[PDB]
Design a protein around this ligand. Structure first.
Ligand code: QB5
Length: 112
């Protein structure tokens, strides 16, 4: 089916985002932001819906995502949180923009 095939493409993208190829800029997005550990005591006041690649992986493994659009919304939420919280000149934003470039160009190659 179309939904299964498109979710296979989504799973391929997710594997790539977690791969050593992209680790130099992907690593801040591997696990939930530990706001308390990083001293970001305003993070959960500013970010209402935290998202990270480990949460996307768990949701994929649990068959939570019903279609490619739902998967993409979580990956883009993760990037949007980074752009909302951080000043645009911060290193983590540069890393987000590079990983989102990887994501958007491969997401565009969706079979349909
Ligand atoms: C996903 C996300 O937004 N993460 C982060 C947000 C704010 C800070 C944070 O502490 N910001 C203020 C201090 C700072 C600036 N540049 C690095 N640390 C560090 C963050 O992730 C860890 C990190 C560390 C080093 C480089 C990239 C990501």
């Amino acid at each position: 089916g179309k939904l299964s095939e498109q979710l296979k493409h989504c799973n391929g993208i997710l594997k790539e985002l977690l791969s050593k190829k992209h680790a130099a800029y992907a690593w801040p997005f591997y696990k939930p932001v530990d706001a308390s550990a990083l001293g970001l005591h305003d993070y959960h006041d500013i970010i209402k819906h935290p998202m990270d690649l480990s949460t996307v992986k768990r949701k994929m493994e649990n068959r939570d995502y019903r279609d490619a659009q739902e998967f993409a919304a979580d990956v883009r939420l993760m990037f949007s949180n980074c752009y909302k919280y951080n000043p645009p000149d911060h290193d983590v934003v540069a890393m987000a923009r590079k990983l989102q470039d990887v994501f958007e160009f491969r997401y565009a190659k969706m079979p349909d």
